[PDB]
């Protein structure tokens, strides 16, 4: 699919940088015709077929195709796409409240944690209902709308690893951040919606304790810990956390993806359900 090849600068003015990655950067921007504000993601294209710099057009198109499908209060949405010889430029919904991750650096109560968690689950329920696996859920990819409120509103961002799961599983090598990837990712096994549910378990553990369940001193140690389900609830961190909260985490951090709670299970779990 080809995108708008007019100069994006004829239609938008850019401002503050919001984020920066290996082959992309996100700038706050303002559309000239409406004064409305967005987040412009500049993705560097591959210059040759066999290079490893830039993002393959297949991977860019996958992200765009998935984003075009999305309309939900807890997931980022796409406004427009432009391109030129060097970049594809996604004009995305503006989220300006910073990362959940940076909000966390400022441990949550269970009520505060579930406040965020419920929005994350609602977002994921929407995605999984559309057979979309995110594959990169972590605190850095949970963004706030306004960070200066009691219960901030969140949007799930970063669909750079997201895949449609048309057969209940995809077999692709889809490798994100060791701390947050499920054992099937570590082991290069077929992957499905279940991988996201593991990531939610890791996020929940961190929300409640400020500690990462599988984090080792090196990436290989972290990955080995994940594959072995090498985690425990440290009393120093969890002594005043309810056993039901621990139960919720325990049913997500399960090696066999078939035995892991699904997104529907997680919404009906007694810790979450009203
Ligand atoms: O996840 S995106 O949907 O692009 C996204 C959407 C909206 C706002 C974003 C702000 C900062 C970083 C992003 N991600 C990002 C990803 C890769 C490189 C640089 C930034 C934001």
Can you name the CATH architecture of the largest domain?
Answer: Orthogonal Bundle
**Quick one: CATH superfamily of the largest domain?**
Transferase(Phosphotransferase) domain 1
Broad CATH class of the largest domain = Mainly Alpha
**What's the count of strands?**
9
Strands in their spatial order, largest beta sheet? 1-2-3-5-4
Structural class determined from secondary elements: alpha+beta
Instruction: Tell me the distance between the termini.
Output: 44 Å
Spell out which ligands are present: 8-anilino-1-naphthalene sulfonate
Q: What's the CATH topology label of the largest domain?
A: Transferase(Phosphotransferase), domain 1
SSE pattern, N- to C-terminal: EEEHEEHHEEEEHHHHHH
Helical content (DSSP H or I, runs of 4+): 25-40%
The profile of the biggest β sheet is: 5 strands, antiparallel
Shape: globular
- Percentage of residues in strands: 15-25%
Radius of gyration: 19 Å
Number of helices: 9
Q: How many discrete domains?
A: 2
